[PDB]
Symmetry: C7
Subunit: 265 residues, 7 copies
């Protein structure tokens, strides 16, 4: 009988009063925090539907938190709701793995700087000048003139070749001449063409060596070092001069040779 | 003996009354929340069987929650049911990883805009004009006229080449002429053809250089910058004009040359 | 001594009575739920051994639940059994990841409809007409006549090219003619063949331009738009007419040309 | 002092008696369950060492469970043992992911039947007649005569082309004839050869169209529908008849043509 | 003041005595279990440093368990140590995923037997005779004579082609003859060569059909079934006999034919 | 009624006083730890916005910790907040997997040293001289002159070929001579060229053997060991000397031979 | 009022005294364990900064453990700190997955020995002699002379071909002779060359059979077994002897034959 010779009914009364207190302060704290986030988002920047589900999801989250806290305050065991809610949080955490990976990689590309804005690089077989580095992705304009947006988590997970870091780079040529050409003559013509060029650095190597005895031609290699801004112009100028002086000196560039053994008359 | 000189039977009575209370309010709250979700889904949009298992799964979920909460209120240890239920929730969370990944990537493609509707792009080797960006996927019509639906989580995880972002792009030509052709003559003909075209931008580079000494031809490169809407028309017009003026000036486009050494008479 | 001046033996007696109560109602609820699932599976649909392990696994699951709940009610700590049981549930949840992924993707392919039954599509390099979309997989008959069953989780994870969505598509031709052919003559013959075809749409583009100066031929491109049902017939008809009028007008389709420089007499 | 004016020593005595009770009933229940599993495995089927570690691992598992339950009954905190044991269970659950995935896929291949025993299929680039579908893998004999065992989790994760599902399939031919051949003559000869064959279905399409203007030959395509058992025989018969009637009608099958421009006398 | 009118100091005294009891029995049980594992490992098999860290890691594990159980018995909250220890156990469980996967696959390859010792198989593009199947890997000697050790988890995860399971296999030939050869003559010569061979099974198929009209040759196919031990010898014998009788009957094996159109005199 | 014949109101008063104490010492400890981290970051090194969100995230973390500790001290159940917070921590832990993997691999590349600064290596098909090894990545300059930044977690996960570790390496040549050349003459010329070179190590192997009977040439192999700094110079010198002495001794380097059977007069 | 008619203030006093006791013994045990690890690391082996962060991280870990144990002893709920700390431990556990995988694989490569030091093997397309097997990686010198460091977790995850395990291996030759050559003459010459070699094992197979009727040559195969140390020398000797005796017996090695049909006079 409930003749009240006990204090457990007092404990039950303070439990239901505490549950109603949790409900009403959860409602008003949800309202005030939604108002504060709504005030601090409009002043800074908003998208309409994005800020809508932002404030809505924060409000539903804090309402669900205070509702199951009030259910647990009464005496209802709420561990299944916490299990489903933790599984849903882990699902959202697996969903946002690539985005947060791009964000962490974007932080690392700002702290450590392998490349900066205006530096010709290569990011996994994609070459071009870096325009800007942002939090999720970098934009880079190629030599063709097209803009490529690459996420940061793929930038760091691969090699990042930087062309504009070292001021001195190397050209390489494969000059195929005929088998009947003199080795010393072709070598001294190529040496004169290399040493008569002022933008080829003389303190580095100036290799002119027979590299390969190919199918229809002996291939010479010539490797010269220039500044990184003069590289393509040195390539074009010395290639044109190689062609002009080999045509002037009688050295022939062979076609795809073939021997034919004639039969059946 | 049960002569009731104790209050633990009072505690057991309020436990079984509380368990029955949890059962009946779980039933009526399941009914009212199923009615409210049923009312708010018919007005907005429904598929028949989809809304059927939606309201059914929400109802079975809240019934299972209140049933094992009522079992735990009696004194039955329910941690194994919570373990299996959390494992099933983690299974469903691993199942919905790709869908929620596409949803998060679709949010990022609306906040950050690498591309918009009506902008010729390239999304992992798939080129075409973007029709619309949605929450799970984007539809884009190619130049061939076919519609391709690409999920957003694969859009962000790869490179996204944007052709219609930079207003000025570059053409490139590989003009192969014979070895006997004059370098200066071919170079000045190509320079006249480039400088006589009004849609080629004169403040950018106008490269006409000998690029390669190939197998049966010397390959010239000519690289010119045009507006992004005039690019293909400039390509076609100046290629036709290259062919006409090289035919008029005697410069030959060589066939695949070959040297034959005749033997065995 | 056990002279019973305490109520903890009363508590122990109600614990062992409660444990026996949990055991017997777990047995009879296992029997009644197995009977109800057995009755509701035979009426709807069954496979014999599949329904056998279905009802068997549900019965062993609820028996294991009530047995370790009764062990925990006595005072035996059962957290290790819950740890192994949660690990086994997570193992089964990792096992059913692909199947539930196919199920979720099959729900998304019914809500959002990129394709329907009877619509020629391409699902990751597999083309053919969709027969039916089911919960785990779609069946599609190719043009060759073979039936291909593709799981839905691989359909959504890749590109889904839809041919029968846009009513107007484009043909493309690479017509290789000889270097000696007149550009204007071949261009006006191709223009007459295009403009004399009634199933080629005249409000779209009708490109006939010199596209490429190839190895042994200049390649013209001609790109015309037709309805999606007339596309292959337009291709065949205008290709046959191109061959007939180029044979009638003296324009030659060249063979793989080659220049031979004869040596060694 | 231990003068026993308290009941906590009574509580400690019933705790150590309960711990000894847990130990001895864990021993005898381990013995009886090991005896029951040993009796039910010998009658059904056994491998010697496999059944050895099966009964051994079940016995060590239930002994470890009752030992740490008895340690927790005394008052020793056992949560670290439960943490290591749950980590080991999750390790074994990650180890058995592929096997249980093959088992779940084998259940799905028996409920849904894309293929049955004796049905020529293609399972990820592996073609052959299905012998039997089992719980972990399917065996299929190829046309070459070799037996291939494919796991089910790789069967469902890829495309499963079924050749023997549709009763009517299509042949396709690429008939390359010379440029000098008449289009109408070759087309009417191929039409007569197709319409004179009784196993080619006349209500389907009978395409005979010029498909491609290739390098050294114009390629005709002819596509005919036959029953799925007559397909290869129709292919062989009509290919032999194409060769015989093109040899009889003067239509030539060209060799790899080449134009040679003779120079250097 | 500590005038001892309470029993909580009695409770604290039995807690510190119980903690010291846990420490000393953890030490002596660690010593006895290390002695028992040390005695049962030396008799069976040991590696020196491997058994060293085995007994050492078991001893440090049981010492860490009893130390944090004794810390939790005093009143120090030890849940952070359990969190780090469970994370380390999950790290070791992720580390041993491939090894335990190979072990589970090795159990499945002994229960189910796709192959046994001395059976020519193909395990993911690796062919050879199986020497032995072990718990982590199988060793197989190829036809070249080299020993290849393949882990079991890669064996089951791929296709396992078994050559020595079916006793009857099929040979296939591509016999390319000239266009001028008679179809009936070549077909009856090949039929006589097939029917004059005693190790070719006559109840199976004996296909001799024109398969392909190739570039420079018509390709006949001949497919014959033999026993699995006579297969290569039948191949060699009937190929030599095909060459001898086609040389005797005037049928020519053509070279790579080519048509040359001579120009520029 | 609240006539205060109980001490639970005393317990509630000390709970709310303890909650306010937790709040105020959480505020001042957050302020002091933020001040201490702010003081110890400015002296050592800072980036502005990076140190901003560093101190901000530490402050919000300790404020959230003390707020939900104060909520749990009152009596509000906070296990859902801990579930969401642990899921967010696991999300951030999955996000930082690649970065911490690169950090652990960078520690292993400093403890174990497969390569050091100034040592020509190959890191997954990327060759060049190592400049420096850092905590997340190594920079290495190639022979071309470009700087490549490779993350450490990809360095250790693949092969790391080290060229500059062994002081003695081997050259290999494929010398193709004509079929009519004498084997003994070519072998003794190559042996004289090898034994007349002083930088070829004589205590190692000096192989000069006929390796291959190729399509148009017999290929000799010659394999010689030199020091690792003389390797390319030995290659170039002995290749030039091979060409000079084979031209002097009449041994011919053949072109791509071909037999032609003339038909159709 | 605090007139002290209760023992809960006594309980609070022993709680704050116990918290201070936990703090001071956590400090001195952190100091003593840091001193003991510092003493046992300097004697054995150290790197400076590595041992620095080792002792530092152990000290910060045990200080964080005793600080949050002392916070939980007071009454502050510390489950959020344990959630973040367990998430950070799981992050570090995912970071060290590859390193611990290499360590476990290195243990398996020492217990099971597929290869030892000084044994020519092939580890995933990388061949060479094993120098040493270590805990994280194996070093192996190739035949070229370069040192390759391969991690153990990639060694076990792939095939490991062992050349130096079986003492007897097999050579294989593809001898292409002309169509006009006699089959019996070439077969008996090859049989005499094989049977006149003493290092070819006579109890194994000595296959000399016509293998293939190729494009311009009939290819004979000859397969002989030798010891594993004589294999390359047998290859070279018998290949040179094949060339010498086929040149002496008039058997010709054909060039790439071609038939030419001359047209257009
Ligand atoms: C989406 C659904 C949203 C629904 C939100 C509704 C919020 C409801 C919040 C407050 C309204 C409560 C009105 C009835 C409560 C009056 C009874 C009472 O004054 O309470 C006294 C006893 C205390 O017992 P005690 O101190 O010995 O327990 C120990 C627990 N310690 C340790 C925390 C103290 O309380 C008891 O006996 C338990 C009495 C049973 C209370 C029945 C009301 C339960 C309401 C909903 C259940 C539906 C479940 C839905 C699925 C969720 C699964 C988790
Ligand atoms: C899919 C299956 C659906 C089944 C749903 C059925 C819902 C049943 C809900 C209510 C009906 C209960 C009727 C019997 C209860 C009367 C006994 C009683 O008035 O209760 C008093 C004692 C209290 O004890 P206490 O305060 O000292 O405990 C401390 C627990 N604290 C801390 C929460 C207070 O209760 C005890 O002694 C324990 C008495 C044992 C109660 C036996 C009835 C158990 C029903 C089903 C068990 C089947 C298990 C199925 C598998 C699930 C595994 C989890
Ligand atoms: C696959 C195996 C299937 C086996 C299923 C068998 C089901 C057995 C179920 C019932 C039979 C019980 C018969 C003996 C019980 C009579 C003793 C008794 O009347 O109980 C009174 C005391 C209560 O103590 P308390 O209220 O102060 O505790 C606080 C616990 N609170 C908070 C929940 C109240 O109980 C105690 O002292 C503890 C007395 C120790 C009971 C010994 C019987 C344990 C049976 C099996 C153990 C084997 C373990 C197998 C591995 C599983 C590891 C989890």
């Amino acid at each position: 009988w409930l003749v009240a010779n006990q204090a457990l009914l007092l404990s039950y009364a303070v439990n239901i009063v505490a549950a109603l207190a949790i409900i009403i302060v959860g409602l008003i704290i949800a309202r005030m925090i939604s108002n504060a986030v709504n005030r601090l988002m409009i002043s800074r920047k908003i998208d309409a539907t994005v800020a809508d589900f932002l404030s809505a999801l924060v409000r539903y989250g804090i309402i669900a938190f205070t509702l199951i806290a009030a259910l647990g305050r009464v005496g209802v065991q709420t561990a299944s709701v916490i299990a489903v809610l933790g599984a849903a949080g882990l699902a959202v955490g697996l969903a946002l793995q690539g985005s947060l990976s791009n964000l962490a990689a974007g932080v690392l590309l700002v702290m450590f700087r392998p490349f900066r804005a205006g530096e010709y690089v290569d990011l996994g077989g994609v070459a071009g000048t870096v325009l800007s580095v942002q939090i999720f992705s970098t934009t880079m304009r190629t030599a063709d003139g097209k803009i490529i947006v690459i996420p940061n988590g793929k930038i760091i997970a691969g090699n990042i070749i930087n062309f504009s870091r070292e001021p001195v780079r190397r050209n390489e040529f494969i000059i195929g001449v005929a088998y009947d050409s003199d080795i010393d003559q072709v070598k001294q013509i190529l040496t004169n063409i290399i040493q008569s060029e002022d933008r080829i650095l003389k303190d580095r190597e100036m290799t002119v060596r027979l590299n390969e005895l190919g199918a229809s031609s002996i291939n010479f290699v010539v490797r010269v070092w220039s500044n990184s801004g003069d590289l393509q112009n040195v390539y074009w100028d010395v290639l044109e001069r190689i062609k002009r002086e080999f045509d002037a000196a009688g050295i022939s560039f062979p076609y795809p040779q073939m021997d034919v053994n004639f039969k059946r008359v």
